[PDB]
Design a protein around this ligand. Structure first.
Ligand SMILES: C[C@@H]1O[C@@H]1P(=O)(O)O
Ligand SMILES: C[C@@H]1O[C@@H]1P(=O)(O)O
Ligand SMILES: [Mn+2]
Ligand SMILES: [Mn+2]
Lengths: 133, 138
């Protein structure tokens, strides 16, 4: 049986610059680094970067695939301004969300809502969906 | 401050067969379904599938980007055998020292890379501190 999330690994083109992004902009706590890998604690999640210099990274911009992290409604504005302050690549009852990318186009989200919030909205607005809970 | 993981969302080309993959092979608990999306509990994580037509998905098999989920050492052979039984696209792992703990790498129907891993971050840091002198610790 799958017991929980273990780790998130991102392929990056420049470990040095990507480390700066995750550490200095998202506040990830660096644990180890070499020339080709870095590990972080980001919101209690084991984050790993592995440098891959020469792989194709053209198609990633087309996919809605992403990982959302939790922030407070209280820190929403503060995050938005900090990301804007840092020339971060921000993308344009659902609750609030900021979408952005790291340096290699990996889509990330800061979200203030819960699974319960989203289920309740869908029960009200979209009762034509199938609900199992 | 980032408080923790909120959800993981995959873009899928055929949501019907991606639902069967996550539900019937990985044992994700399905919560919601429409023609365009599906929500699961997988290992206490909010997992979302979003159907997207005509996105190019050929480059993804070249990237090491992936998400790893925890299984028990006790369940490792049963997981492996189960993914084999269901003709899952199991990938050739990297080379593995005993201290790296154990892993099964595979993809879903859209080539997203997944890992079943039996170790902790603590185990890896412990392995690397003893075996990896080209590494910096903090
Ligand atoms: C720790 C980073 O995911 C990689 P591994 O699967 O090569 O250990
Ligand atoms: C629910 C899955 O995250 C997607 P959303 O960002 O479209 O809400
Ligand atoms: Mn999202
Ligand atoms: Mn891994």
């Amino acid at each position: 049986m799958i017991k929980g999330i273990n780790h998130i690994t991102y392929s990056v083109s420049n470990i040095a610059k990507s480390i700066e992004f995750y550490r200095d902009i998202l506040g990830a706590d660096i644990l180890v680094e070499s020339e080709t890998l870095a590990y972080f604690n980001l919101g209690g999640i084991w984050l790993a970067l592995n440098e891959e210099k020469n792989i194709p990274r053209s198609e990633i911009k087309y996919s809605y695939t992403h990982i959302a992290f939790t922030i407070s409604d209280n820190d929403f504005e503060d995050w938005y301004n900090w990301l804007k302050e840092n020339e971060v690549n921000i993308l344009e009852r659902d609750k609030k969300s900021i979408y952005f990318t790291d340096l290699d186009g990996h889509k990330l989200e800061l979200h203030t809502g819960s699974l319960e919030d989203r289920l309740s909205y869908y029960k009200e607005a979209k009762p034509h969906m199938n609900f199992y809970i």
